[PDB]
Amino acid sequence: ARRRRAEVRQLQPDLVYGDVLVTAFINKIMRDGKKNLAARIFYDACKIIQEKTGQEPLKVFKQAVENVKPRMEVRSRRVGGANYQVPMEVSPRRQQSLALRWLVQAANQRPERRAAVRIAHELMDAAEGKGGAVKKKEDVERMAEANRAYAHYRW
């Protein structure tokens, strides 16, 4: 990215809820370009949110994400000596990136053997605001506060 700003690569709407945010999340689930298998999972998992709660999946989903977005984080920095964990505001596009990435990672950290379940129970534990994703997210936010002393370096 020396020359340009690079356009936020624009995604193909969810062919089932009509949501760009969803595809995004489907892609993060995908391994070796098995997009089919990936969507099976996301949807089978929306299945497991009715079969377990009254409310709409797209709604659990939107919400789980919201809780997992970090607002500040430490970026590393050169100074005369060694380095400084410099807290700074996290841009909206990145917030999204991190949320989804974290949901999928946290999901596959869970104990249940079948993927759609893991995805679901994590989605569920998130909107309630107590998944291991929201954990490794308060860890960031807290750590940006620990370092509040160095917030006079933000570019």
Binding site: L15, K35, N36, A39, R40
Partner: protein, 127 residues
């Protein structure tokens, strides 16, 4: 009585034939959902109709040959679209906005010598 647009996408070509009235869709002497059997995306190929409002009110007979499945899904998506603009020059100004009308040039880029794979380059060790 009859309508045609040709779709292509990456080795795969679509023969589309629209007929008035109905809702059912043959592909290669097979039901749609029989050809694209639980392949999550297929429901996309007919999105050109959904956008015009002819959601149902057309029959479609289809040949489709070339390389592979998910391309064919898009191939059709062009056929359908092209075929129905040739049943209405007025079907431009709504299909073009979502551009179901652009061929989409993106092919397998070609394997280059010295690389492993077109871009993927071999493994440097330095020391």
């Amino acid at each position: 009585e009859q309508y045609y647009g040709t779709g292509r996408r990456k080795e795969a070509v679509a023969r589309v034939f629209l007929r008035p009235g109905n809702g059912k869709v043959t592909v290669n002497g097979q039901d749609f959902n029989e050809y694209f059997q639980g392949l999550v995306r297929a429901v996309a190929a007919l999105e050109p109709l959904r956008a015009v409002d002819a959601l149902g009110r057309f029959d479609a007979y289809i040949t489709v040959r070339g390389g592979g499945k998910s391309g064919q899904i898009d191939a059709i998506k062009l056929g359908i679209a092209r075929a129905l603009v040739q049943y209405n020059p007025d079907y431009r100004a709504k299909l073009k906005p979502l551009g179901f009308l652009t061929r989409d040039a993106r092919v397998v880029e070609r394997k280059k010598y010295g690389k492993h794979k077109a871009r993927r380059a071999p493994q440097y060790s330095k020391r």
